[PDB]
A paper describes a structure:
To further determine the role of disulfide-stabilized dimers for the ability of MPO to evict nucleosomes, we chemically reduced the single disulfide bridge between monomers in native MPO dimers, which efficiently dissociated the particles into stable MPO monomers that were still able to bind to nucleosomes. In cryo-EM, we observed nucleosomes bound by either one or two MPO monomers or by one MPO monomer and one MPO dimer through the same acidic patch interface as in the non-reduced MPO. This shows that MPO reduction did not change the structure of MPO monomers apart from the disulfide-stabilized light chain N terminus, which becomes disordered, and did not change its interaction with the nucleosome. As with non-reduced MPO, only the MPO dimer but not the MPO monomer induced disorder in its neighbouring DNA terminus, showing that this reduced MPO is a valid system to test the relevance of MPO dimers for nucleosome disassembly. Only at a 16-fold excess of reduced MPO did we observe faint bands corresponding to the cleavage product. This is a further indication that dimers are required for the ability of MPO to displace nucleosomal DNA and disassemble the nucleosome.
Numbering used by the authors:
A (entry chain A): 40 to 135
B (entry chain B): 23 to 101
C (entry chain D), I (entry chain H): 28 to 121
D (entry chain C): 11 to 118
E (entry chain L): 207 to 577
F (entry chain K): 5 to 104
G (entry chain E): 39 to 133
H (entry chain F): 23 to 102
The structure:
DNA sequence: GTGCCGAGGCCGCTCAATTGGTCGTAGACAGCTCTAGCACCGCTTAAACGCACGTACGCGCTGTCCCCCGCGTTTTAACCGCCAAGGGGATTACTCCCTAGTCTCCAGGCACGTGTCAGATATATACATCCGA
DNA sequence: TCGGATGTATATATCTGACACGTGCCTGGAGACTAGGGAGTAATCCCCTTGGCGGTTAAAACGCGGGGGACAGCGCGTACGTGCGTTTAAGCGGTGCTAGAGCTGTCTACGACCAATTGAGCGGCCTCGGCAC
């Protein structure tokens, strides 16, 4: 058995070295179609459009999680909490 | 259709691990899903507006690229 | 002396239309002029980009409408769009 | 020759359609400018100006003053969510800040 | 060959008394006041014709359904159409863009913590339409020209007169007169016409009635507060002296008359204070009436679970099909009319400056209602 | 819950009677009466409201609302469509029954 | 008589959020601007409007930064703002 | 010329008070001075570049406004 | 089957100048082309704004130089300027 | 170790760069004005600068407990490979409104000058609030 | 837990300077007319997007155990807010000088605009090895 925090560090090292997408493609495409259904009906999506949306979303989420980690470390903690995400979004000017 | 749940807990865990996060609380998955939904809604609304102006029924990659660029999120590799 | 064009009289006319018994200072007038110039530049630039994307070389009311819908957030945009139409149609009637 | 009447009067506006058309033509925006674009732009500008001026006048009346100052414009802009979003990255001179205090700092 | 409203049987008919020779009792509808003038009867008949045509089309599209399902579906579509037309065309022209944006923001979802009941003050603050009544009724022929006999009819002779719609060419001339005649602009020195003030229900009643006086009397009977209390309720400043009242109303003579009548702004009736305030920019009501009406309609929209924009109520394709509806399209698709006004029918009042041949406007696509 | 009820009841789960028919109105402000309970102002002669005599409604409409008909100004942006749809919507919304 | 700590601070917070004047003396700021510009060009003249615009922009930027710093300090279950809060706010903002 | 000390401690305290800060540490002032110096250096460098391109010798308000717009801090009140 | 111009051959030529024995993939080519387009658009737009500010109708070498100085950060900008100057000088010589 | 799909090198055109005059306007000089930026001095005096107290707050030091991580098992749907339809992006041509370009006139909107009335500034007052007993 | 001290909003004069008009004029917007290239409709063409099926298996779910951060409580000691007295240049005026920003005038040379020419680069075609298994 491995003590907690070792497998997490191994995963951090592994996922920071690879470039592959971390979200399954079909569920993300389904979510994108569901969201776009509101603005217009009977819409067609190119594969490149869905790929670009996925890449942009993943990059945005990774940057947000980096800022959230900084916020959590500031409060003398290791565990990410929703208040850290809210503070990062408020400071960046998204929810302000 | 509840496809917002398609973004699973392991996927969010992988995204956080890529960002350097060591420990994750169990109450942040819903917040991440909401944030992703808001971002996708904004970008897709802009892309659909761009498509509608061009009198088309297909959302090309160029429309998404323009929508991302107009929000200060320029994306390289798709045109 | 060289004349300096500005959106001074028009803002005052709009203010008299809205608030018939209220004045406006010089600093507020300058702020209003800067705001009008900034919004004009933003909308015109968005319309130019839209015209260039579709390989067209003419700015029409459709480009302005799409630029307004893209820039102005929420209900504002909708109202603005209506006003735009409410003008152009009238300009066609005369 | 028929008596000359301005284009703004034809469209029932207060902003100058002709000046906007000249600015669009000389602004190096596109090779050609349609006849309906200046009317649309003038209508949009007039609507936005009327909205912000109405809010500022309401603030000034609530402050028992009969003249608009940049503080009133700042209050009108910041108190409206849509106008605040539109002018999120804009600094208004002599505007001050919206009065608020965090609930943590207040005494119990 | 087009349907009309069914007749009504009552113990006493103050509506047959207008014309003893015709012997034509007026109609029955969802409201007992549907025969005040031929215009209201024409509107109710048009709505009934639209419901019948929609039911026929739905039955033709889907024959498996029973009559009750057909009636319920037609009623639902008619209600959604009425809500769409109202909240998309009428209120923006009443409140004005600023008041509409302030009191009616974008719809989000149904809220169960808001009150959908009608406030008591709304039964008076909504009487502003009593200041938009033209003194005469206009009927026009197929060419929008004055149609004979009686191209213009005094309003004192058209009250409770159903015989003027069954035996006078139907409802098409009435609709043409409604769609191609400017309304009455409300001015500070011109509040309401004398036809409704001195010759109201002259034939039916022994003596005429005073509509503004009735409005004030009903406001007092309901025990509604004064002008100052409602001004303070909406956040507007409260006048106290003659000068403050003149500043608020932007008029001195009218303020002096009000002061000589009541003596204090707190005693001013709600209706007079609402209709005496200067109109908003591109609006038809003062700030207080706009506040009351916007609050009431926002409460009605938020608290309605069957709102057409609410999820589950309609499908996305159904919502897209419904979003293209318009009053001129319905007025063309349910009667013998052949020339209607442009979009925002409440604004177009000049022929033929803004009138279309109504052969190019889209129809209501019901192809999404297949089971 | 599939279709609306004619009487309008049960629309709200917390209070089914909320928004139904044949119900009392909503008072956004407390009602004012001369006796304070049920007497509308002007019923009893000699009463003073807010330290001032109660003005007669008929006179108020007589010398303020009245104006010469020949000076009627038509509206250049509205039509009878406005007033007709307003009356129809109001007839949809509310109705106060009164004793015969 | 002596007010307990934090009372005059709240009074000053309420007072300075109602005014619209400039909180930095004009002459020291003008001297600082001239000294900073001396490193780029020699014998440079400044319009009064330019110095006023620089002062307004600097004051607005500092006020926004202090608001963000106060938010950061409150997040850490503290009341006193510290340079770590300023650094964190600047890092998150992207500066 | 050490004019960075012209931004006195009471001035920084007042600026913090406008921002809603109740308690201020003693080391805040130096960091605030450094941040202000960096911001002023950037804006003034851009304004001087704009002036030099115009072959002028006076830094007008238009140059400062254009520099602020370039940095993304559009300022209303001066020029257009 | 239509012509689609791109900065493909020139990027390959520069790469062969820098790394004669190193290849480049298609995704990297697309990224490089997008980067070149973005930088070109940025510099051209800044130069146009500079020309408009000074009431000039011509984009010259001075406008491009000032735009490069304003946009590109740090010593990078300086180096870029040098290269451009040299090029212009050479183009004047022949 | 191993194949295979992707990066790399060759032909055929054809649609832009290039060479070669023309010209008319944008910009580069020289002159001259006069506005405003710089500098200098004297006086208040409001601001800043030290100094002492002590009180509240930042900061370590236990304690526990519950929640998140790590692991094993059954379960679910992503994913790859393949087929068949058909909606609808891309081209082409063919005009037809629609808009650029030019005189000519005027009115709309600049600058310059003025008088009066919102508004900032004392001053006493009546609240509104805080720390204490 | 009622009373004292202080801070502050408010009502009443008072002077002032800047804002809303008024007037002159000049140039940029409107009225016409003509000419040509942008694009709005139609008619194909094929391509690439959606839908469906089947087998594999890799990732998502779920339950269990434990140990390690999160949060609470408790000194403590120190440093920052609050007055209070003592320097100190900031702001306000008035004055004077000249630096350079702006305007006028002329001229000249340089980039847009024509046309004929031809070759640079893009598309399609093979072809072999760098690398993901
Ligand atoms: C056009 C001619 C109209 C006439 C002749 C008329 C007449 C009347 C009369 C006699 C009553 C009952 C007693 C009274 O209120 O005086 C009434 C009720 C009412 N009317 Fe009108 N009406 C007209 C139009 C309108 C319009 C256009 C509106 C609103 C847009 C309106 C709003 C109301 C309301 C809210 C009531 C309810 C009063 C109550 O229930 O006590 N009316 N009308
Ligand atoms: C004065 C009056 O009402 N006269 C009517 C008349 O207009 C109508 O034509 C006739 C038949 O209905 O009945 C009677
Ligand atoms: C419903 O309305 C209440 C009262 O205005 C409000 O507090 C609440 O947030 C609303 N709820 C939703 C879900 O909009």
């Amino acid at each position: 058995r491995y003590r907690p925090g070792t497998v997490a560090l191994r995963e951090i090292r592994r996922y920071q070295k690879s470039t592959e997408l971390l979200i399954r493609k079909l569920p993300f495409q389904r979510l994108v179609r569901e969201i776009a259904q509101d603005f217009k009906t009977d819409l067609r999506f190119q594969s490149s459009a869905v790929m670009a949306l996925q890449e942009a979303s993943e990059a945005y989420l990774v940057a947000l999680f980096e800022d959230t980690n900084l916020c959590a470390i500031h409060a003398k903690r290791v565990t990410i909490m929703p208040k850290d995400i809210q503070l990062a979004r408020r400071i960046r000017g998204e929810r302000a | 259709r509840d496809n917002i749940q398609g973004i699973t807990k392991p996927a969010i865990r992988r995204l956080a691990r890529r960002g350097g996060v060591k420990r994750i609380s169990g109450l942040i998955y819903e917040e991440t899903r909401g944030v992703l939904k808001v971002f996708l809604e904004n970008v897709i609304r802009d892309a659909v507006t761009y498509t509608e102006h061009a009198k088309r029924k297909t959302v090309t990659a160029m429309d998404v690229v323009y929508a991302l660029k107009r929000q200060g999120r320029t994306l390289y590799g798709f045109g | 002396k060289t004349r300096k064009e500005s959106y001074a009289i028009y803002v005052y006319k709009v203010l008299k239309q809205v608030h018939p018994d209220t004045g406006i200072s010089s600093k507020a007038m300058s702020i209003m002029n800067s705001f009008v110039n900034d919004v004009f530049e933003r909308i015109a630039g968005e319309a130019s980009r839209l015209a260039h994307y579709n390989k067209r070389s003419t700015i029409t009311s459709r480009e302005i409408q799409t630029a307004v819908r893209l820039l102005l957030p929420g209900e504002l945009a909708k109202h603005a769009v209506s006003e735009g139409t409410k003008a152009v149609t009238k300009y066609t009637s005369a | 020759r028929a008596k000359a009447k301005t284009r703004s009067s034809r469209a029932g506006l207060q902003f100058p359609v002709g000046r906007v058309h000249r600015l669009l033509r000389k602004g190096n925006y596109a090779e050609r400018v349609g006849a309906g674009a200046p009317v649309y732009l003038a209508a949009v500008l007039e609507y936005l100006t009327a909205e912000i001026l109405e809010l500022a006048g309401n603030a000034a009346r609530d402050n028992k003053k009969t003249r608009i100052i940049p503080r009133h414009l700042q209050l009108a802009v910041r108190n409206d969510e849509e106008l605040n979003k539109l002018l999120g990255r804009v600094t208004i001179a002599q505007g001050g800040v919206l009065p608020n205090i965090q609930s943590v700092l207040l005494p119990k | 060959g087009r349907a009309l409203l069914p007749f009504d049987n009552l113990h006493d008919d103050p509506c047959l008394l207008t014309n003893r020779s015709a012997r034509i009792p007026c109609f029955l509808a969802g409201d007992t006041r549907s025969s005040e003038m031929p215009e209201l009867t024409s509107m109710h008949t048009l709505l009934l014709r639209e419901h019948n045509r929609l039911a026929t089309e739905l039955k033709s599209l889907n024959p498996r359904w029973d009559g009750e399902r057909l009636y319920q579906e037609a009623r639902k579509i008619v209600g959604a159409m009425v809500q769409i037309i109202t909240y998309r065309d009428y209120l923006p022209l009443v409140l004005g863009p600023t008041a509409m944006r302030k009191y009616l923001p974008t719809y989000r979802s149904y809220n169960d913590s808001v009150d959908p009941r009608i406030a008591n003050v709304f039964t008076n603050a909504f009487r502003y339409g009593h200041t938009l009544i033209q003194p005469f009724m206009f009927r026009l022929d197929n060419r929008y020209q004055p149609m004979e006999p009686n191209p213009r009819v005094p309003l004192s002779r058209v009250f409770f007169a159903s015989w003027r719609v069954v035996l006078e060419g139907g409802i098409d001339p009435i609709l043409r007169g409604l769609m191609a005649t400017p309304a009455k602009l409300n001015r500070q020195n011109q509040i309401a016409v004398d036809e409704i003030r001195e010759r109201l229900f002259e034939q039916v009643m022994r003596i005429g009635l005073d509509l503004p006086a009735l409005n004030m009397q009903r406001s007092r009977d309901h025990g509604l507060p004064g002008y100052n209390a409602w001004r303070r309720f909406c956040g507007l400043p409260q006048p106290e002296t003659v000068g403050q009242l003149g500043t608020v109303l932007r008029n001195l003579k009218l303020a002096r008359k009000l002061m000589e009548q009541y003596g204090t702004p707190n005693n001013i009736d709600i209706w007079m204070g609402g209709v005496s305030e200067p109109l908003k920019r591109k609006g038809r009501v003062g700030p207080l009436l706009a506040c009351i009406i916007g609050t009431q309609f926002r409460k009605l929209r938020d608290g309605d679970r069957f709102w057409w924009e609410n999820e589950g109520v309609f499908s996305m394709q159904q919502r897209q099909a419904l979003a293209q509806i318009s009053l001129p399209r319905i007025i063309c698709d349910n009667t013998g009319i052949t020339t209607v006004s442009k979009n925002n029918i409440f604004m177009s009042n000049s022929y033929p400056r803004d009138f279309v041949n109504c052969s190019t406007l889209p129809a209501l696509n019901l192809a999404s209602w297949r089971e | 819950d599939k279709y609306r009820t004619i009487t309008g009841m049960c629309n709200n789960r917390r209070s089914p009677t909320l928004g139904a028919s044949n119900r009392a109105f909503v008072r956004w402000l407390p009602a004012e009466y001369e006796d304070g309970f049920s007497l509308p102002y002007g019923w009893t002669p000699g009463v003073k409201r807010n330290g001032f005599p109660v003005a007669l409604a008929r006179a108020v409409s007589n010398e303020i609302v009245r104006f010469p008909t020949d000076q009627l100004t038509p509206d250049q942006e509205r039509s009878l469509m406005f007033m007709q749809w307003g009356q129809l919507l109001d007839h949809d919304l509310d109705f106060t029954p009164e004793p015969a």
